[model samples]
Target: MTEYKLVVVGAGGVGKSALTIQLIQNHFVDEYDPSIEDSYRKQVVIDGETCLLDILDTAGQEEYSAMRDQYMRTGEGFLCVFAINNTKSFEDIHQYREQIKRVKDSDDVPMVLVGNKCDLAARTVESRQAQDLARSYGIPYIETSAKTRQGVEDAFYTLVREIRQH
Candidate 1:
């Protein structure tokens, strides 16, 4: 099967595991989110074509920076996630993007700016703000709630779609 490698990164508590586990959770036996493997594989069908999606899930810790660069180099696309309640997480995208660019040495990479925990409201960093920033950078922005399973699949599917062309 055709395989696409995607790396999911974000500041801690932004629901990297929540989002990813909702997607890959069914295929594995782990009861917890963010499986010990730090990788997940799934068979998906898009546009009548089936492909294996291999995702590299960063645990979203400051100490993970070193491992991130290594995974960044191997990934085909990225999902930069941030929680809506935390503006600091939202404001940090440029740093993550720049680091990805630094590792890849190019700007032509597929990225999805993910605003997780959309289940909550009255936050400083909401969908509109996230969308605007994504537009400024010319990337797709999506809001997802793993609890409700809202837009979670779309995030991975979109990233893989980008990799298909990339």
Candidate 2:
């Protein structure tokens, strides 16, 4: 089986786990317990080509910094999620990107920048700016809402397509 490891990294409460659950099970959890660590392994067939996706959903808080490098080292690609309404999360993407680059050291590795929580447009902060940042880094960007189930599949499929090409 052809296996691909994809890591989801972002600050705390930025919807990394939510996006992961949505992508894997098409749903979300209420009152999430951060202390519980979870990883999902599944197979997805895109255009009749089957591949195993081992998704590592890591913690976003600073306490988990030690494991960040370990996660980055194992991932073949990344889904860097940031909340559209949270500027701090948006700002942290730069740091996350740098850390991933240092650990992976492969410019060709695919990364999909996800601006999650699109349903809360009223509280948005620098959505367009985030898109510009993704463009500058040559990564695909999209606004997604786990609650509404919008742009959830696109985020994963886009990375799948990029990975297939490489």
Candidate 3:
């Protein structure tokens, strides 16, 4: 069995937990309350393939320097999530990227830049700028909506496929 350690990093209220829950359980919480911090782990199967996806659902309020270090030691793939409606989340991508690099000690890890809440594009803070950002980081980018299940599977599958080829 191939095990893939996938970490979801983003700011608070950026829908990291929501997207994680939706992807793993295929359900959404009506009004999500942000109470959990640190990390959450779960196993998911896709197309007869079983892999362990360790989702680090963290609190964006407090700095988790230690947790970030531990996650980097084991992470094989990453889904850097940001809310389309919040530009601060998008702006903090640099800090998140820096933390990943410091922990993982490399810039070659397979990553997917995710713009969460595509359904709320009307209130978006960032647009197709994600494409350019992804290009700058040399990673794949996808806009996803957990509510409508749009691009949710694609985001996960795309990274999984990339790992399979490696």
Candidate 4:
């Protein structure tokens, strides 16, 4: 079976669950689970092949910081999401990205940088800023609004493509 273990990482309240739930359940969510890790599975066709998406939505809670490395090891690819309206959340993306690389012990990880909540009018993180950050990491950057379900699929699918490439 072609299964992809994808992890969604971001600071607290950055719509991590919203994006994943939107992908799997096709609904805007406030998470059906309140745990350190919530796993979701869905079968989808990507690039003409049936692929199983096994996604991990980790807790953005600061108390769960110690457990990040555990999940990071098992994830094949990651969607590093941040809020466009929250500047601090956007700044925290670097830490999440760096932590993944350190835990994986490789710089060439399959990752997609995501800017969530683009539906908000008060965007503190400029589109170009995120674009430049992704460029620096040599990865694809996507803008998503989980509430509106914009770019949500593209964000997850692009990570699958990244994994396929790697």
Against the correct fold, how does model 3 do in TM-score? 0.83
The RMSD of every model to the true structure, in order and in angstroms, is 1.9, 2.5, 2.8, 2.2
TM-score per candidate: 0.91, 0.88, 0.83, 0.92
The sequence of per-residue lDDT tens digits that candidate 1 reaches over residues 19-128 is 88899777557577544438877888976889898888786546534566779899989999998889999988888899889999998899999988888876779678
lDDT of 4 by residue, 1-166 (tens): 6999999999999988888878898446555644556889989999998999999998873645566788899999999999999999989998888888889999999999999999999989999999999999999999999889899999999999999999
lDDT of 3 by residue, 76-126 (tens): 777888888888888888888887888778878788898988898465565
In terms of TM-score, the best-performing candidate is 4
Who wins the lDDT comparison? 4
| Model 1 bad stretches (over 4 Å) | 27-30, 35-37
lDDT of 2 by residue, 28-128 (tens): 55455346446787688877878788888888746545666777888878888999888898889988888888888877778999999999956656767
lDDT of 2: 0.81
Sort by lDDT, top down from the best: 4, 1, 2, 3
Number of backbone clashes in candidate 3: 0
Once model 3 is optimally superposed onto the true structure by TM-score, how far is the C-alpha of residue 162 displaced, in angstroms?
Answer: 3.0
- Sort by TM-score, top down from the best: 4, 1, 2, 3
Clashing pairs in 3: none
The TM-score between candidate 1 and the true structure equals: 0.91
Report the C-alpha displacement of residue 95, candidate 3, in angstroms: 0.9
